[PDB]
RNA sequence: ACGAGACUCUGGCAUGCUAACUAGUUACGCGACCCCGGUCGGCGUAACUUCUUAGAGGGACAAGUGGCGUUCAGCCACCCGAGAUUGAGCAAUAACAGGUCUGUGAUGCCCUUAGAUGUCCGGGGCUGCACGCGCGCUACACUGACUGGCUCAGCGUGUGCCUACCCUACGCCGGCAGGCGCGGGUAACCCGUUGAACCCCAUUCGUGAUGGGGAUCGGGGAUUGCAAUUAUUCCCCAUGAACGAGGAAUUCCCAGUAAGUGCGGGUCAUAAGCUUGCGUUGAUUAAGUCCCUGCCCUUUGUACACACCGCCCGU
RNA sequence: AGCAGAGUGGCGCAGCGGAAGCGUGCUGGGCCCAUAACCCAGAGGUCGAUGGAUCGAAACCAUCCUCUGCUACCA
């Protein structure tokens, strides 16, 4: 079962995100945001590059990850607009670093929940709120509040025991975090 | 943007020549009902005639040519 | 992009029968396709169950066709 | 009735092959090799089992009844032109053959054709089209 | 003067005219069935052309009205009206090293002419298969597949010259493919009121490479023909592959049109996935443009004229 | 004798738990009257080898082999 990454249901404007392209279309295309529970976005043909293009499949490449910046977000109707043309290479390194650390935290906690054998979207939301979202809101860092948390809690049990989630599941998650992040 | 532009309903008065690269669109002389003095020219796409009402999302743009 | 491979059961067990008996007569629009989608059952089983409740008098028939049948609930009062 | 009965067998092991009980009994035994859609209707018509029932809820008496009907077709008023092997080249009798027997009979028939070195056996040994059709354009996935 | 137009064929209508036992309608009588009337492509004979058939004629001409236009050639819309642009046939000067010597007792020249490149018979090949391309047929399913019932057409063709080979109603046998006796038609007379398919109604199936799709492959039985193996064609039972709406690119069409769907003719002893016609159901979009690919006229420039797929400079 | 770099498609190279790609070489197709430019698709991989924990390593661990950057022949 899959769950969303951060507590924001939709990203804010001018935010970088690692996007997998799903299918090419006529007026635009159809894509999927990895770190927002696979919601359908859109990239435009005019938002590909500033220069002239001679092959639409040379830079789109459906089936490949791409870094895009959010342009317009409409939470009322679920409309997401993306832009690859405005993406600068300076934030790109921080982008896949944040994406990799968030996906490793999500993979570790999903493995812990699969060991715990709980198959419900609300159950994953509640356990991941008890595990990561609380300390993410405490440290005030989107994405940066999990990798440093497990790095500081791999050698310190008192830092990891501050969350009042459970006892046996908390010990299983602490053992899974200490086994991987070593 | 921070601007919720009110929509305008406007009524055509005459049909000008058909612009565009392949002639897909045509030019009309259109006028409003809330103020029946202001008349602007708009590029409209589709089968039009004399008497149909057009829904203009903005009323401050003047019709560009084919290019 | 979730697959979620379907396994539509052929014969009714203990629990799906009485959830059907408590939920299907409280539905505004009753169709074999939509009750097979809601209860994750096979289409012939849905047709047999709606025919059984039609014979039981808890289901009001509206229109009958070779492509679909349309059923509706009864009045509460 | 519409509720599932007790000891509803999910799978069957009729002639050492897995047969599911979810399919219709007129079509679940079609998965047995050597018995098709048309042959399954006659077997279930000579035997007194209605074809509106499922496969996994029938009992062992009628199961073994239709099993002995399938291995013995002709002694239950089944005509001789309904058989997949009529006037066999070795023993010369009408006998419907089943899955592993069908593979064995086809293998020894191809071996007999290769032994007598006919054109059909030579084309079967080479691995080409044997029924006599054009091979200039069609049949591209035979080799790489 | 030619081309266009004008002309010819067909479609769309006239309850008016000319005539129909090889086409019918309406009345009357007989006959069958039901509960006093209804049904009968059951039988027969008193008028007629309402259906059908096919001849002469009629009708549409931008005729009437209102706008635009030198108020000229014309354009737009509307009323009455079966139609206010039906579809085709024919189609000028000048040429293409366009295709055909394999349509010809149309033919120049060249080759061969008795161990023949003539002719005839027997066998084989034209199908052969690591691959590429074009025109096509069937599908990827639930607006669907299977199983019953109900119900509706129009173009045609049909017993042949030396030439042998036609289309079939009815009765029996067999699941079917088929076989045997009997009759009709040289044809509005008989097949035939051509009980066509797609559709319509009602079960079974339930999103599963599945009852989709039928490739590949095995066995048996009939017909044609002197002869079917390299399976002629058909029928029956098994075998159940790829295929989940198709990349770059590209074809055809705007009204009973595209598309779905079946039936005739040509090849035919045996015979349609091809071609040419016919009828059934029946749409979306558009009344514009010169952007792409081209065409017609005029002006301009040219070192090209087997004519830009031209010409031509230098290391 | 010993320490580190590297072992990936014909060649060069990126990749570290949810996972065989890029540039380029070959073949085929399209575009054009034709060729060169241009576009598309496919084939080609024990990720050097072994064993283990790990739900599951091209990767985490230990060893071996190969070529360089280096101390050098050290009884």
Swiss-Prot record, chain A:
Residue numbers of Phosphoserine PTMs: 46, 49, 155
PTM sites of type N6-acetyllysine: 138
Taxonomy, superkingdom: Eukaryota
Post-translational modification: Phosphorylation at Ser-46 and Ser-49 stabilizes the eIF-2/GDP/eIF2B complex and prevents GDP/GTP exchange reaction, thus impairing the recycling of eIF-2 between successive rounds of initiation and leading to global inhibition of translation, while concomitantly initiating the preferential translation of integrated stress response (ISR)-specific mRNAs. Substrate for at least 4 kinases: EIF2AK1/HRI, EIF2AK2/PKR, EIF2AK3/PERK and EIF2AK4/GCN2. Phosphorylation on Ser-49 by the EIF2AK4/GCN2 protein kinase occurs in response to amino acid starvation and UV irradiation. (Microbial infection) Phosphorylation by vaccinia virus protein E3 and rotavirus A stabilizes the eIF-2/GDP/eIF2B complex and prevents GDP/GTP exchange reaction, thus impairing the recycling of eIF-2 between successive rounds of initiation and leading to global inhibition of translation.
Gene Ontology BP, a term: cellular response to amino acid starvation
Domain S1 motif: 14-85
Key words of the record: Acetylation, Cytoplasm, Initiation factor, Mitochondrion, Phosphoprotein, Protein biosynthesis, RNA-binding, Translation regulation
The keyword DNA damage appears for this protein: no
Consequence of changing residue 49 to A: Abolished phosphorylation by EIF2AK1/HRI in response to stress. Abolished relocalization to the mitochondrial surface in response to mitochondrial damage
Cysteines joined through disulfide linkages: none
Stretch of the intact protein here: 4 to 185 of 315
Curated annotation (Swiss-Prot), chain B:
Pfam families: Ribosomal_S28e
Key words, A-Z: Acetylation, Cytoplasm, Endoplasmic reticulum, Nucleus, Phosphoprotein, Ribonucleoprotein, Ribosomal protein
Keyword Hydrolase attributed: no
GO BP terms, alphabetized: cytoplasmic translation; maturation of SSU-rRNA; ribosomal small subunit assembly
Coiled-coil residue spans: none
One of the record's GO cellular component terms: synapse
InterPro entries in alphabetical order: NA-bd_OB-fold, Ribosomal_eS28, Ribosomal_eS28_CS
Subcellular location: Cytoplasm, Cytosol; Cytoplasm; Rough endoplasmic reticulum; Nucleus, Nucleolus
Location of Phosphoserine modifications: 39
Chief place where the protein resides: cytoplasm
Molecular functions (GO terms): structural constituent of ribosome
Top-level taxonomic group: Eukaryota
Role, per record: Component of the small ribosomal subunit. The ribosome is a large ribonucleoprotein complex responsible for the synthesis of proteins in the cell. Part of the small subunit (SSU) processome, first precursor of the small eukaryotic ribosomal subunit. During the assembly of the SSU processome in the nucleolus, many ribosome biogenesis factors, an RNA chaperone and ribosomal proteins associate with the nascent pre-rRNA and work in concert to generate RNA folding, modifications, rearrangements and cleavage as well as targeted degradation of pre-ribosomal RNA by the RNA exosome.
Family designation: Belongs to the eukaryotic ribosomal protein eS28 family.
Subunit structure: Component of the 40S small ribosomal subunit. Part of the small subunit (SSU) processome, composed of more than 70 proteins and the RNA chaperone small nucleolar RNA (snoRNA) U3.
Annotated protein name in UniProt: Small ribosomal subunit protein eS28
Curated annotation (Swiss-Prot), chain C:
Gene Ontology cellular-component annotations: cytosolic ribosome; cytosolic small ribosomal subunit; nucleolus; postsynaptic density
Subunit structure: Component of the small ribosomal subunit.
Predominant place of localization: cytoplasm
Lineage: Eukaryota, Metazoa, Chordata, Craniata, Vertebrata
Positions of post-translational N6-succinyllysine modification: 14, 56
Keywords tagged on the record: Acetylation, Cytoplasm, Ribonucleoprotein, Ribosomal protein
Location in the cell: Cytoplasm
GO biological process, any: rRNA processing
Modified residues (N6-acetyllysine): 5, 14, 22, 28, 56
Similarity-based family: Belongs to the eukaryotic ribosomal protein eS25 family.
Designated name of the protein: Small ribosomal subunit protein eS25
Chaperone keyword on record: no
Cited function: Component of the small ribosomal subunit. The ribosome is a large ribonucleoprotein complex responsible for the synthesis of proteins in the cell.
GO molecular function, one term: structural constituent of ribosome
Span of the entire protein shown here: 38 to 114 of 124
Organism per entry: Oryctolagus cuniculus
Membrane spanning stretches: none
Curated annotation (Swiss-Prot), chain D:
Positions of post-translational N6-acetyllysine modification: 93, 105
Subcellular localization(s) per the UniProt record: Cytoplasm
Residues found modified as N-acetylserine: 1
Short name of one Pfam family: Ribosomal_S13
GO biological process, one term: translation
Molecular-function GO terms, alphabetical: rRNA binding; structural constituent of ribosome
Cross-link (Glycyl lysine isopeptide (Lys-Gly) (interchain with G-Cter in SUMO2)): 90, 93, 105
Highest taxon listed in the record's lineage: Eukaryota
Keywords: Acetylation, Cytoplasm, Isopeptide bond, Ribonucleoprotein, Ribosomal protein, RNA-binding, rRNA-binding, Ubl conjugation
Signal peptide boundaries: none
Gene Ontology cellular component terms for the protein in this record: cytosolic ribosome; small ribosomal subunit
Protein function: Component of the small ribosomal subunit. The ribosome is a large ribonucleoprotein complex responsible for the synthesis of proteins in the cell.
PANTHER family: 30S RIBOSOMAL PROTEIN S13/40S RIBOSOMAL PROTEIN S18, SMALL RIBOSOMAL SUBUNIT PROTEIN US13
Family under the similarity heading: Belongs to the universal ribosomal protein uS13 family.
Oligomeric form and interacting partners: Component of the small ribosomal subunit.
Protein name: Small ribosomal subunit protein uS13
Native species: Oryctolagus cuniculus (Rabbit)
Lineage: Eukaryota, Metazoa, Chordata, Craniata, Vertebrata
């Amino acid at each position: 079962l899959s769950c969303r990454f951060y507590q924001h249901k939709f990203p804010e404007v001018e935010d970088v995100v690692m996007v997998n392209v799903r299918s090419i279309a006529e007026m635009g295309a159809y894509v999927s945001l990895l770190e927002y529970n696979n919601i359908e976005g859109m990239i435009l043909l005019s938002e590909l590059s500033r220069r002239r293009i001679r092959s639409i499949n040379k830079l789109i490449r459906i089936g490949r990850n791409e870094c895009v910046v959010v342009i317009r977000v409409d939470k009322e109707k679920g409309y997401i607009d993306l832009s690859k043309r405005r993406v600068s290479p300076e934030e790109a390194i921080k982008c896949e670093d944040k994406f990799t650390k968030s996906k490793t935290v999500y993979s570790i906690l999903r493995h812990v929940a699969e060991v715990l054998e709980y198959t419900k979207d609300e159950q994953l939301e509640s356990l991941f709120q008890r595990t990561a979202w609380v300390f993410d809101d405490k440290y005030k860092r989107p994405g940066y509040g999990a990798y440093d948390a497990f790095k500081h809690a791999v050698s310190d049990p008192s830092i990891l025991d501050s969350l009042d989630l459970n006892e046996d599941e908390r010990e299983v998650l602490i053992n899974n975090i200490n086994r991987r992040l070593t | 943007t921070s601007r919720v532009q009110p929509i305008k309903l406007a009524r055509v008065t005459k049909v000008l020549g058909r612009t565009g690269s392949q002639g897909q669109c045509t030019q009309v002389r259109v006028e409003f009902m809330d103020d029946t003095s202001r008349s602007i020219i708009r590029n409209v796409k589709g089968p039009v005639r004399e008497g149909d009402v057009l829904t203009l999302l903005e009323s401050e743009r003047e019709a560009r040519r084919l290019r | 992009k979730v697959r979620d491979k379907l396994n539509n059961l052929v014969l009714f067990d203990k629990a799906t029968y009485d959830k059907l008996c408590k939920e299907v007569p409280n539905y505004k629009l009753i169709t074999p396709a939509v009750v097979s989608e809601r209860l994750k059952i096979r289409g012939s089983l849905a047709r047999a169950a709606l025919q059984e409740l039609l014979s039981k008098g808890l289901i009001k028939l509206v229109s009958k066709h070779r492509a679909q049948v349309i059923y509706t609930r009864n009045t509460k009062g | 009735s519409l509720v599932i009965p007790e000891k509803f067998q999910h799978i069957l092991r009729v002639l050492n092959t897995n047969i599911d009980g979810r399919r219709k009994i007129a079509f679940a035994i079609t998965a047995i090799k050597g018995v098709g859609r048309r042959y399954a209707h006659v077997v279930l018509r000579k035997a007194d089992i209605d074809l509106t029932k499922r496969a996994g809820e029938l009992t062992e008496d009628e199961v073994e009844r239709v099993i002995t009907i399938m291995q013995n077709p002709r002694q239950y008023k089944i005509p001789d032109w309904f058989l997949n092997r009529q006037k066999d080249v070795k023993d010369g009798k009408y006998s419907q053959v089943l899955a592993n027997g069908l593979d064995n009979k086809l293998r020894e028939d191809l071996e007999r054709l290769k032994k007598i070195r006919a054109h059909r056996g030579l084309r079967h040994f080479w691995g080409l089209r044997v029924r006599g059709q054009h091979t200039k354009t069609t049949g591209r996935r035979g080799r790489t």
